């Protein structure tokens, strides 16, 4: 649907897979940038889910869809991948902010949801 229900989504975003109409700053307003950033989102999401010669052959073909997908499962991949990149950035930020691993901090949140979070530790809020 819509990232902001009531906001008017741009016309270039409609029809794309995984399009919730989110482009406030209009970076995909041109087709050349929109096609390349579609590849970048898919590659970032695929690397986040799992976390020279291979990357060179990725862009050797002159096609458009083969650089991205070499309709329901595409949206399924895009909604799962974005959560994976959010999760990895959360892992980096939490290990930078508490000094602990990503799994033991889940147990610390479970054992104290109201006294141990990003608000309490003196890194995320000075």
């Amino acid at each position: 649907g819509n990232w902001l229900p009531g906001s008017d989504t741009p016309a270039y975003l409609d029809g794309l897979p995984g399009s919730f109409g989110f482009d406030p700053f209009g970076l995909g307003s041109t087709p050349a940038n929109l096609q390349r950033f579609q590849e970048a989102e898919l590659v970032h999401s695929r690397w986040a889910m799992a976390g020279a010669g291979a990357e060179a052959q990725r862009n050797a073909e002159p096609d458009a869809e083969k650089r991205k997908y070499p309709e329901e499962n595409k949206l399924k991949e895009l909604k799962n991948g974005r959560l994976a990149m959010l999760a990895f950035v959360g892992f980096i930020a939490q290990h930078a902010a508490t000094g602990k691993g990503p799994l033991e901090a889940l147990k610390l949140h479970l054992a104290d949801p109201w006294g141990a979070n990003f608000a309490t530790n003196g890194v995320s809020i000075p």
Partner: protein, 222 residues
């Protein structure tokens, strides 16, 4: 026009439609249109710098007066931050020179050719950030993330920005002059004025009216 800076005077015609205009140009600096465009940008840039600076001075000082925080005073905050700064002084200057050279050249290029930093191939794929609005001094894009320039209060917000900007510019120069004249911070200066306004002002700081130029000060006293 927002008004007349001097009621009854003849206001210049080239300032009739500018936001924040009171017809104030007695030195005729903005009579040339290209100069006027450059000075509009310069006034906005000075306004926004002073705005942020006066915020970063006054809000810590207000919260220090309220007992909330105890951050260092503004004229000594450079020393205290530099000792604890992981980055040394020279590297900080070099980084600031590089970053501001880049961003000010981008702003300058947009001033000379409007919308030219948002064209296709201008930036490295991220040119949609910097499309501009076709208005001198109002970039938008990343700089207007909430999109409030597209609302109906945009023209009144331009006027609010300029008048608050001029007030902040005067306020920062007042901060600097008050420190040079009294040696104390701005909230202490305000409290001293509030305790005795007749005796605690610039006429008694020993600097603003030099004693040699004003011999009546040493004479007309109890």
């Amino acid at each position: 026009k927002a008004g007349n800076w001097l009621p009854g005077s003849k206001t210049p015609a080239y300032l009739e439609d500018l936001p924040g205009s009171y017809g104030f140009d007695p030195l005729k600096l903005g009579e040339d249109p290209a100069s006027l465009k450059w000075y509009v940008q310069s006034e906005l840039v000075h306004s926004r710098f002073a705005m942020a600076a006066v915020a970063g001075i006054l809000i810590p000082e207000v919260l220090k007066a309220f007992g909330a925080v105890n951050l260092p005073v503004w004229y000594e905050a450079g020393k205290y931050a530099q000792e604890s700064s992981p980055i040394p002084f020279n590297t900080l200057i070099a980084l600031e020179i590089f970053a501001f050279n880049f961003v000010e050249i981008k702003r300058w290029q947009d001033f000379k050719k409007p919308g030219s930093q948002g064209e296709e191939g201008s930036f490295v794929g991220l040119e949609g950030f910097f499309k501009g609005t076709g208005e001198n001094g109002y970039p938008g894009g990343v700089f207007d993330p909430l999109g409030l320039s597209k609302g109906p209060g945009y023209e009144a917000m331009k006027l609010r920005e300029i008048k608050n900007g001029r007030l902040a510019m005067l306020a920062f120069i007042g901060f600097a002059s008050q420190y040079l004249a009294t040696g104390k911070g701005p909230i202490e200066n305000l409290l001293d004025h509030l305790s005795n306004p007749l005796a605690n002002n610039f006429t008694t700081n020993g600097t603003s009216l030099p004693a040699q130029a004003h011999p009546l000060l040493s004479v007309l006293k109890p």
